[PDB]
């Protein structure tokens, strides 16, 4: 938004699915995709397209199961002026491991799993679930 970008992103999706929306959109950004991969490649979205070599556009194709949405439990965390950082023995574990928390480790951003799997900490992001 007119301050913190990513914040809006996580919202856009949670909002859309809230009203069985097709697929919300937002101006794509390198960090936006790094968090996008951990969605399509982590089972949470169909896929994301692009548009604009100079004026990009992210496209998170939401999903829904039986009679409810898929990604129905997302929230930001390491927001500005409150950024959170934790060590390996502090790493998160979204909803008792049942969920996932995007973590921007020194070795690229990746799901909570790859965090311990790779053995290292990173800028915790959201609590996808």
């Amino acid at each position: 938004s007119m301050q913190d970008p990513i914040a809006d992103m996580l919202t856009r999706i949670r909002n859309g699915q809230a009203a069985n929306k097709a697929a919300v959109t937002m101006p794509s950004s390198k960090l936006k995709v790094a968090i996008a991969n951990v969605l399509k490649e982590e089972g949470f979205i169909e896929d994301f397209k692009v548009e604009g070599d100079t004026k990009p556009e992210l496209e998170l194709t939401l999903k829904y199961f039986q009679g409810k949405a898929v990604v129905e439990s997302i929230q930001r965390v390491s927001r500005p002026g409150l950024r959170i950082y934790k060590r390996k023995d502090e790493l998160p574990k979204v909803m008792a491991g049942l969920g996932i928390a995007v973590v921007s480790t020194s070795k690229g951003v990746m799901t909570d799993r790859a965090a311990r799997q790779a053995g290292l900490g990173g800028e915790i992001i959201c609590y996808v679930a």
Partner: protein
């Protein structure tokens, strides 16, 4: 070598000495939030070739004066 610090020579109205307020960060021991701080020291500059609005690294050493225990090591930035 120590570690030094690219502090700010806020003061220079002294001789062979200059008050410098070093910027610092730290997480709140409760609410947890990176906050800026300051470290005003009485550096020493025999030749007094620093200047205000500038930027220099300071190093601790023998107690030169009552409060002045640091000396100038280099002037990274300067001008105004």
């Amino acid at each position: 070598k120590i570690r030094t610090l690219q502090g700010r020579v806020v003061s220079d109205k002294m001789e062979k000495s200059i008050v410098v307020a070093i910027e610092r960060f730290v997480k709140h021991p409760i609410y947890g939030k990176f906050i800026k701080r300051t470290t005003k020291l009485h550096v020493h500059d025999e030749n007094n070739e620093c200047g205000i609005g500038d930027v220099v690294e300071i190093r601790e050493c023998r107690p030169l004066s009552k409060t002045k225990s640091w000396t100038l090591v280099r002037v990274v930035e300067k001008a105004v």
